Amino acid sequence: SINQKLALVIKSGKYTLGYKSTVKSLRQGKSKLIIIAANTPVLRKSELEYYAMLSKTKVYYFQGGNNELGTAVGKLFRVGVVSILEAGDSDILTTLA
Amino acid sequence: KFLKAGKVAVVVRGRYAGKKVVIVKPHDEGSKSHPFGHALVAGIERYPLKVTKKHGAKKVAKRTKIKPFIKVVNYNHLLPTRYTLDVEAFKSVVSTETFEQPSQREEAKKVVKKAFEERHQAGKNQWFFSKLRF
Amino acid sequence: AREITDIKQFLELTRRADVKTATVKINKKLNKAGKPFRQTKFKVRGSSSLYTLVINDAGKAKKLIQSLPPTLKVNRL
Amino acid sequence: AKRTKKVGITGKYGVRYGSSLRRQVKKLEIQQHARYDCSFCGKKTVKRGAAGIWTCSCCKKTVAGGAYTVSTAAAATVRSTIRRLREMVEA
Amino acid sequence: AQRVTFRRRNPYNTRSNKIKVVKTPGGILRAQHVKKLATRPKCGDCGSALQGISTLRPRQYATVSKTHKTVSRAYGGSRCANCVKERIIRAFLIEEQKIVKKVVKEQTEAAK
Amino acid sequence: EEEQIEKDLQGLQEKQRLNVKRERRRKNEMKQKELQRMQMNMITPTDIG
Amino acid sequence: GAAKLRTLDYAERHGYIRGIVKQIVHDSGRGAPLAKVVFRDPYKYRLREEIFIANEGVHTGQFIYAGKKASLNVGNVLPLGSVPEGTIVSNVEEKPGDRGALARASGNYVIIIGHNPDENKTRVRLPSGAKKVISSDARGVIGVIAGGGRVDKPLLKAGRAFHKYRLKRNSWPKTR
RNA sequence: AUAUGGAUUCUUCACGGUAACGUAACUGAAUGUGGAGACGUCGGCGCGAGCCCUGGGAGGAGUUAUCUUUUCUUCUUAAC
RNA sequence: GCUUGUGACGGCCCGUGAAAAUCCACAGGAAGGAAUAGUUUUCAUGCCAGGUCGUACUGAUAACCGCAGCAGGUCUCCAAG
RNA sequence: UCUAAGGGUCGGGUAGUGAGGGCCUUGGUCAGACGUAGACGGCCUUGGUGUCGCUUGCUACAAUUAACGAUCAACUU
RNA sequence: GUGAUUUC
Ligand SMILES: [Zn+2]
Ligand SMILES: [Zn+2]
């Protein structure tokens, strides 16, 4: 499941939580995948997509809001965008989800 | 990894917000003077006015005037684009030591101004010489 | 009413074309609970503003009084 | 703990207006003065400005909703059925 | 213990007839009528009080210089620079969407 | 001394148990409050955003 | 300002015009909140404001599409012929050009029953329960009028009735 | 109405600051748009002003049968 | 502490609590503007001018209304120990 | 006539190296217009009020007793 | 048309 593969990534690999950190990663060319909450404002969505296109990074839209994405990643705070820097254990990068 | 020399970005903060600049030198590590990932960039302060077939010779010459600027910019204050512009004509003049002298800034701005005017007259990069409407 | 600090600006202002009258005012004050010292205020009357220059040194005030233009009419106290 | 055994938010009305009327007012009053979550930014920062108008303290978004609660069940079902039948129009 | 009076002929505690009490060089208390307090100008998009702009009654802006009424940026005296940043980003992405969408439309009508 | 420190240790462990119990009470109270909001129709879906 | 739809024109007849919601405001004497929607005037280079009746879910900054070929989303207005079976609309035009007459009070709507072959006609169930046939070109806003559940709260007080009815034309207190 | 100084200009219509923004200035017709004017009531909390209370000191007046380093009073500062 | 002004907040509403004159700004860019010479009166300074009508006094057990110079009535501001 | 309780502001060091600010007691060079007098002032200190100290860089229990001290003030129980 | 509310 998508939550399960996200949990594996959170417990094994490298991730950054938040818009500023994920933009920094996209600028530095470190990200592989970006999970964007369905609640994110559309201007931020389009800006993140433009950054990911320029950086050749995959974009996946999470189903759910900030609360759902935060609790899925396993934190007690709302999370809007997660960037995957390393997914050495989990296979979330290749799956269609 | 795409913020390099020759890339065209859009300034989103500061007095030149809304202008299009080209990165001449990216310092991703930063420096002692600017302890943040920044970029020496050159841009256009006053775009050349859009001319037509009717305009006379003197009118075209006076409407094709460009005011450039040079600035060190934080990466967070740039909206990088997908476009490229040849920076080699002023890579030597636009440098770290230039910004420490108001007169050297003036001479480097002369160089950048004439380069941009030549490119605009040749007809290259009409988007880069086009003004953003926001 | 405006306070002016530069002596050069004060002299140019006292040579200004609209200026006709000035006033020299003497105050007795104390410097940091010190001895009773002299304060000289030079007040030049402009069309819009009265310009005041405060000098705390008596000899400098006297030499400036000498330096004043002749045509300017000075009222003492 | 509990300053009032049963009357709750209706304690401002004292002994007036009748028990049944106070009870009926109670539920709608609790709905009205409550602080709701924001669908747009995901924070519990939404309060009523006027009957039907609900504003979020953060992100400064004003939305139209029910008189005493942010959403009505009728509105929720209308939203869902609109989604369903527009999907079937696409399909 | 010294008591004061209104100095204009309006005898009522109206919004435009507010006084303060001030001691004068004659050593007496006196009423001093105070004008209405100025309101900070607001951003045209979000409504927040834009910074770097003087706070004056509307007629007084005709007296101060330009620097008091603007900042050195696009929409300097009207928008609050976060709205300006979002406006710039939105315009750029609208242009980019136009480019991509036009290319897609041309290719689609080629292959359709 | 030995019996007094035994009493101190038993009291400290009882204190920890009491803290765990109060945390459980807060969790249950939050659960009841959430269910009350669900019954009262005080929950907002995210489909609008 | 009266709460009326946009004036009918070629854009709304064939394509769509996009406006933006600026504020959701309280109207004295009206249960339902109003929405101010700004459109671009197709002929003259100037922005035109409109005062719609806010449906439930309409929010500030939202894009509202008006026309035959606009998305079937809450807030969007559509000719009744462009919507499928079973949809729910508000501020329904009785006939083309009246700018909205049915289901304008809070928590009220109009359901679509079915269309007509012979001409452009559609039949609808009104809030009372009547079944009426209007021109299929008549427009309506998708969704339900905001402010529902208002009548469920007792007033409890002659003073609350006083404040409610001094804004209306109903005589209060009542005589005879 | 106008002149002088300042500013600006041979990169014509200013530079500085990463930025929020700064400054003595730093051209502008149609047209479009935004802000101020411009706003209910109640509660406590913070701050300012006048007043109230009060200490020292420098003056004036009262009391002194006995007592009181005493009682009263002046020591102020406008728009801009 | 009292009077008052003000700031950031909280509560209440099926009640959500004027308009216009007027002033400023932004977007835009018709244009105009310099080399033994121009520009800028949103910087400073300097020059000129500001008409008409009200303005005394009371504002009440003596100034108004009740046929009075009536033990009545009539809006509001300041407020010491 | 007493007793108890209820507060505020300032307080961290010398064991230790060396420079910095100001009328620098006395002592040293350059050196200021006016009415026998002559200040202030444009320059410096290892000193002074093992070589006190007002300042940073720092090793050394920085406080797990600041669990205390110096100083200031109101009226309540 | 009846006039809070509850119960009988
Ligand atoms: Zn929100
Ligand atoms: Zn803004």
Curated annotation (Swiss-Prot), chain B:
Pfam families: Ribosomal_L27e (PF01777). The keyword Transit peptide does not apply. GO terms for cellular component: cytosol; cytosolic large ribosomal subunit. The keyword Cytoplasm applies. It is found in: Cytoplasm. Keywords: Cytoplasm, Ribonucleoprotein, Ribosomal protein. GO terms for biological process: cytoplasmic translation. GO terms for molecular function: structural constituent of ribosome. Present with 7380 molecules/cell in log phase SD medium. There are 2 genes for eL27 in yeast. PANTHER family: 60S RIBOSOMAL PROTEIN L27. Component of the ribosome, a large ribonucleoprotein complex responsible for the synthesis of proteins in the cell. The small ribosomal subunit (SSU) binds messenger RNAs (mRNAs) and translates the encoded message by selecting cognate aminoacyl-transfer RNA (tRNA) molecules. The large subunit (LSU) contains the ribosomal catalytic site termed the peptidyl transferase center (PTC), which catalyzes the formation of peptide bonds, thereby polymerizing the amino acids delivered by tRNAs into a polypeptide chain. Belongs to the eukaryotic ribosomal protein eL27 family. Component of the large ribosomal subunit (LSU). Mature yeast ribosomes consist of a small (40S) and a large (60S) subunit. The 40S small subunit contains 1 molecule of ribosomal RNA (18S rRNA) and 33 different proteins (encoded by 57 genes). The large 60S subunit contains 3 rRNA molecules (25S, 5.8S and 5S rRNA) and 46 different proteins (encoded by 81 genes). The gene is RPL27A.
Curated annotation (Swiss-Prot), chain C:
Keywords: Cytoplasm, Ribonucleoprotein, Ribosomal protein. Present with 50200 molecules/cell in log phase SD medium. One of its GO terms (cellular component) is cytosolic large ribosomal subunit. One of its GO terms (biological process) is protein-RNA complex assembly. The gene is RPL38. It holds the Pfam family Ribosomal_L38e. This is Large ribosomal subunit protein eL38. It comes from the Eukaryota. InterPro entries: Ribosomal_eL38 (IPR002675), Ribosomal_eL38_sf (IPR038464). Component of the ribosome, a large ribonucleoprotein complex responsible for the synthesis of proteins in the cell. The small ribosomal subunit (SSU) binds messenger RNAs (mRNAs) and translates the encoded message by selecting cognate aminoacyl-transfer RNA (tRNA) molecules. The large subunit (LSU) contains the ribosomal catalytic site termed the peptidyl transferase center (PTC), which catalyzes the formation of peptide bonds, thereby polymerizing the amino acids delivered by tRNAs into a polypeptide chain. It is found in: Cytoplasm. Its main location: cytoplasm. GO terms for molecular function: structural constituent of ribosome. Belongs to the eukaryotic ribosomal protein eL38 family. It comes from Saccharomyces cerevisiae (strain ATCC 204508 / S288c).
From Swiss-Prot, chain F:
It is found in: Nucleus, Nucleolus. Residues 13-42 form a coiled coil. Transmembrane segments: none annotated. Disulfide bonds: none annotated. Required for proper assembly of pre-ribosomal particles during the biogenesis of the 60S ribosomal subunit. Specifically methylates the guanosine in position 2922 of the 25S rRNA at the stage of 27S pre-rRNA maturation. Also methylates the uridine in position 2921 in the absence of methylation of this residue guided by snoRNA snR52 at the stage of 35S pre-rRNA maturation. Component of the nucleolar and nucleoplasmic pre-60S ribosomal particle. Interacts with the snoRNA-associated proteins NOP1 and NOP58. Belongs to the class I-like SAM-binding methyltransferase superfamily. RNA methyltransferase RlmE family. SPB1 subfamily. This is 27S pre-rRNA (guanosine(2922)-2'-O)-methyltransferase. It comes from Saccharomyces cerevisiae (strain ATCC 204508 / S288c) (Baker's yeast). The gene is SPB1. The chain holds residues 348 to 396 of 841 of the full protein.
UniProtKB/Swiss-Prot annotation, chain G:
One of its GO terms (cellular component) is cytosolic large ribosomal subunit. There is a cross-link at K22, K69, K95, K121 (Glycyl lysine isopeptide (Lys-Gly) (interchain with G-Cter in ubiquitin)). Transmembrane segments: none annotated. The modification Phosphoserine is found at S28, S71, S135, S136. It is found in: Cytoplasm. Keywords: Cytoplasm, Isopeptide bond, Phosphoprotein, Ribonucleoprotein, Ribosomal protein, RNA-binding, rRNA-binding, Ubl conjugation. One of its GO terms (molecular function) is rRNA binding. GO terms for biological process: cytoplasmic translation; maintenance of translational fidelity; ribosomal large subunit biogenesis. Its main location: cytoplasm. Component of the ribosome, a large ribonucleoprotein complex responsible for the synthesis of proteins in the cell. The small ribosomal subunit (SSU) binds messenger RNAs (mRNAs) and translates the encoded message by selecting cognate aminoacyl-transfer RNA (tRNA) molecules. The large subunit (LSU) contains the ribosomal catalytic site termed the peptidyl transferase center (PTC), which catalyzes the formation of peptide bonds, thereby polymerizing the amino acids delivered by tRNAs into a polypeptide chain. Component of the large ribosomal subunit (LSU). Mature yeast ribosomes consist of a small (40S) and a large (60S) subunit. The 40S small subunit contains 1 molecule of ribosomal RNA (18S rRNA) and 33 different proteins (encoded by 57 genes). The large 60S subunit contains 3 rRNA molecules (25S, 5.8S and 5S rRNA) and 46 different proteins (encoded by 81 genes). There are 2 genes for uL2 in yeast. The gene is RPL2A.
